[PDB]
Amino acid sequence: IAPLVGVGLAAGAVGVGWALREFEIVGSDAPPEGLTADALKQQVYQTAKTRKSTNASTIVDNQNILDGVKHTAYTDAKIAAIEELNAGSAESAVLDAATTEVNSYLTTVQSNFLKTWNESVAELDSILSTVVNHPDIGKGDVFLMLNGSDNTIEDLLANPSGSTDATSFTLADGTTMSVGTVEVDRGTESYYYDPMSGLVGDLGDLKNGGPTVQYDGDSLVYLNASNWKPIYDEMDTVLQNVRSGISTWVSNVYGDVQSGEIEVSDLVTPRERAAMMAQEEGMSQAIADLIALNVPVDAEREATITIQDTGATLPGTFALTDASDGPLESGKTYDPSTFSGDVYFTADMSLVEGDWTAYQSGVDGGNVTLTSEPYSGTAVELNTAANETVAVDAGNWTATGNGTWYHDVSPELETDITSIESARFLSTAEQTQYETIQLQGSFTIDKLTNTQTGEEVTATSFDSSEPHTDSNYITQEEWDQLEQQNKELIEKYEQSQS
Numbered sequence: 001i002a003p004l005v006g007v008g009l010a011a012g013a014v015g016v017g018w019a020l021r022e023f024e025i026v027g028s029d030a031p032p033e034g035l036t037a038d039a040l041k042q043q044v045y046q047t048a049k050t051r052k053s054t055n056a057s058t059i060v061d062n063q064n065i066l067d068g069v070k071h072t073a074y075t076d077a078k079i080a081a082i083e084e085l086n087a088g089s090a091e092s093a094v095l096d097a098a099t100t101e102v103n104s105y106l107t108t109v110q111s112n113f114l115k116t117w118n119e120s121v122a123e124l125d126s127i128l129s130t131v132v133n134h135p136d137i138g139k140g141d142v143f144l145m146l147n148g149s150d151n152t153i154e155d156l157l158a159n160p161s162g163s164t165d166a167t168s169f170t171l172a173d174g175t176t177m178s179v180g181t182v183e184v185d186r187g188t189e190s191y192y193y194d195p196m197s198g199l200v201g202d203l204g205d206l207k208n209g210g211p212t213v214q215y216d217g218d219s220l221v222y223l224n225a226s227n228w229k230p231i232y233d234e235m236d237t238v239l240q241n242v243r244s245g246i247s248t249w250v251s252n253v254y255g256d257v258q259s260g261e262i263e264v265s266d267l268v269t270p271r272e273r274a275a276m277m278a279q280e281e282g283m284s285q286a287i288a289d290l291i292a293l294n295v296p297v298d299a300e301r302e303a304t305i306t307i308q309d310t311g312a313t314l315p316g317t318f319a320l321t322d323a324s325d326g327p328l329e330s331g332k333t334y335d336p337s338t339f340s341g342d343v344y345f346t347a348d349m350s351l352v353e354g355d356w357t358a359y360q361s362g363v364d365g366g367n368v369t370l371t372s373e374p375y376s377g378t379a380v381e382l383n384t385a386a387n388e389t390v391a392v393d394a395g396n397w398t399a400t401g402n403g404t405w406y407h408d409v410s411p412e413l414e415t416d417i418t419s420i421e422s423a424r425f426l427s428t429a430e431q432t433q434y435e436t437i438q439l440q441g442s443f444t445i446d447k448l449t450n451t452q453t454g455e456e457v458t459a460t461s462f463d464s465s466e467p468h469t470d471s472n473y474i475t476q477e478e479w480d481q482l483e484q485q486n487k488e489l490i491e492k493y494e495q496s497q498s
């Protein structure tokens with residue numbers, strides 16, 4: 001089965017909780033030993049494809065949410081600085097309390113980011129163990145093993161956190177963390193890759209940066225330090241800018257802002273609210289986390305989109321990392337690849353629709369054939385020439401090695417021998433499946449509707465709270481507005497999702 005988000009919507013899953021709190025990382029799932037030659041090659045490819053997808057869903061595809069990390073860091077730093085200020089502490093103590101909150105929060109962000117990389121290197125190490133141990137296969141049968149010069153590398157190794165060849169990274173907290181490395185053996189010399197160092201930069205590096213996993217003519221690159229280095233550098237820029245900025249903020253506020261002027265002890269931070277929602281059941285977490293990361297959102301305008309490449313229709317709300325790409329308009333086609341920022345879409349996956357054209361017209365004795373893989377959590381509803389409608393779930397379609405999907409529909413049919421005139425796909429799910437996806441492929445807004453008034457509007461309006469700076473959030477009004485804008489955005493999504 002093909003993933004609905006990945007293929008059907010030409011999108012990516014969104015997990016941004018790692019930038020807000022301690023996040024649950026997807027554990028290593030390396031193929032077992034004792035497998036057949038083909039199955040190991042297949043499972044190594046599947047293990048790398050799933051790892052690339054989960055690393056993209058959380059870290060790699062969301063590099064533009066770090067502006068929200070900067071905003072979140074400032075909220076906690078300023079609150080702690082205001083507490084010490086209201087208590088009549090020395091400027092030193094006010095700044096120390098602020099910096100500790102910056103360092104404590106950014107350690108949780110750095111740790112989540114490096115644990116995601118560590119789990120990938122650890123899983124790679126157990127892949128390379130299973131590959132070497134397999135009697136019929138070597139590393140070159142599953143990996144490209146080429147460098148920039150298109151020459152075969154001496155060896156591809158993975159040193160998990162704790163290993164002698166794993167790097168030691170100092171967190172904002174001042175504590176040390178071991179980070180796993182992707183090793184390229186060059187004899188006596190060796191290349192080590194981690195999110196901090198990235199690639200070496202010469203032709204001795206892996207042809208495509210990270211290991212290239214190949215199986216049955218299809219291949220993929222993952223664990224590419226070139227994709228992790230810009231995220232680390234921007235995260236490191238944020239840590240340095242918030243530290244220097246809060247030192248400036250404290251100097252501008254100390255003496256000027258009097259004790260009792262600002263009262264933010266009773267205030268529940270957007271980060272805290274999203275952490276609380278993560279502990280319970282309710283609205284979809286990625287949008288709760290995206291609101292907490294102060295990403296411009298249009299909660300009030302429901303848009304029905306058509307993913308151009310597949311024809312999949314989906315109703316939902318938009319979120320833009322950079323509202324400069326916006327305002328998105330009704331009837332217009334948008335290419336997210338031309339956008340300066342990233343496009344997010346919160347929708348009920350149970351409402352995914354779309355015309356299915358990847359089918360064979362001839363029904364050979366009840367056996368209906370599909371020329372493309374059906375999507376996960378969906379069912380292909382076929383309309384026969386004798387006006388008979390039958391829906392078959394994705395898991396009930398049987399695959400052949402020649403890229404076709406068959407299912408015996410003779411028990412549900414009266415006229416087994418017929419021709420399929422029409423076909424469409426719809427969700428299998430009975431309950432709501434609200435989720436946030438990142439739009440990668442082109443899409444057209446077929447309609448825009450204001451959810452409160454119920455009217456058909458022509459443009460979108462993105463809302464976010466004022467971002468933090470070294471001179472702002474020095475008044476009660478500013479802090480009360482932050483609290484209120486967050487509360488009304490959460491309530492808006494909580495109302496729409498029930």
Ligand SMILES: *[C@@H]1O[C@H](CO)[C@@H](O)[C@H](O)[C@H]1NC(C)=O
Nearest residue numbers: 377392393394395396397428
């Ligand atoms: C497939 O068919 C079974 C009956 O054999 C049905 O109960 C189930 O809902 C279907 N779902 C999948 C994904 O196989």
Ligand SMILES: [Cl-]
Nearest residue numbers: 144145211212
């Ligand atoms: Cl490789």
Ligand SMILES: [Cl-]
Nearest residue numbers: 052055222223
């Ligand atoms: Cl990756």
Ligand SMILES: [Cl-]
Nearest residue numbers: 198199226229
């Ligand atoms: Cl790099």
Ligand SMILES: [Cl-]
Nearest residue numbers: 284286435436
């Ligand atoms: Cl979600």
